[PDB]
Amino acid sequence: APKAPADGLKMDKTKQPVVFNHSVHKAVKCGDCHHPVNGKEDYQKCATAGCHDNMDKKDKSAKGYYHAMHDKGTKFKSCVGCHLETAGADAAKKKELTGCKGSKCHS
Ligand code: HEM
Ligand code: HEM
Numbered sequence: 001a002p003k004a005p006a007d008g009l010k011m012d013k014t015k016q017p018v019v020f021n022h023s024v025h026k027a028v029k030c031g032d033c034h035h036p037v038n039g040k041e042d043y044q045k046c047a048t049a050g051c052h053d054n055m056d057k058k059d060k061s062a063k064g065y066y067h068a069m070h071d072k073g074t075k076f077k078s079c080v081g082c083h084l085e086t087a088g089a090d091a092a093k094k095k096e097l098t099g100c101k102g103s104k105c106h107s
């Protein structure tokens, strides 16, 4: 099977890069993130050409990179969407896990 990479990976397609740590996410199935495409979990980088390669942050299509990391109501939970559910009503966790600045994603 594909193996989880080391912690400390940088997502740096944008001027607001974010560090992603697989170990913290080990209770999430791999294929919730590396989701099926044409019936097979796809482990390519998310912004591979033909994937989430649209770097317009207002785009809401299946190519919109920002959309795939931030929005609710998506077919697979996004970073922010899952974090909102995790934080629940806890305001401190909302800031830490979902804040647009001063959060664990963005300084
Ligand atoms: C589950 C144990 C699991 C596996 C296996 C896995 C693999 C994996 C690989 C091989 C990479 C590197 C891709 C590359 O070629 O650079 C990678 C990268 C990311 N992953 Fe992952 N991953 C597993 C689990 C999870 C889970 C549960 C999530 C979502 C909460 C997730 C997310 C990511 C992200 C984001 C990246 C970086 C990709 C990018 O920036 O394009 N992974 N993973
Ligand atoms: C990389 C780990 C990665 C992430 C993160 C990601 C997220 C993502 C979301 C949140 C959706 C749902 C969007 C919605 O509006 O419903 C989604 C959907 C699709 N993706 Fe994706 N995706 C990641 C990786 C990849 C890769 C590597 C590809 C291209 C091979 C890709 C493609 C697509 C496609 C197509 C969709 C729509 C799927 C469907 O409707 O069944 N994603 N992704």
Ligand code: HEM
Binding pocket: 018, 019, 020, 021, 024, 025, 028, 032, 033, 069, 077, 078, 079, 080, 082, 083, 086, 093, 097, 104, 105
């Ligand atoms: C989407 C690519 C994504 C990112 C980015 C991300 C980041 C992230 C950070 C920065 C933390 C805090 C710990 C750390 O520094 O690593 C964190 C914590 C949790 N996450 Fe996450 N996360 C992304 C995606 C997802 C998805 C899609 C889910 C749920 C399906 C998820 C869940 C969690 C959980 C649970 C934690 C731990 C929360 C806590 O309070 O410690 N993340 N993630």
Ligand code: HEM
Binding pocket: 011, 012, 013, 014, 015, 016, 017, 018, 055, 056, 057, 066, 069, 070, 079, 080, 083, 097, 098, 099, 100, 101, 103, 104, 105, 106
């Ligand atoms: C709060 C809802 C919030 C905002 C607003 C926000 C903005 C933001 C911007 C402007 C970018 C850059 C987009 C571009 O193309 O210029 C960006 C990028 C990423 N973000 Fe974000 N972001 C908000 C919150 C969060 C949170 C809480 C997380 C982590 C759960 C997160 C994650 C990401 C990821 C991943 C990226 C892409 C990093 C990269 O590849 O450079 N955002 N965000």
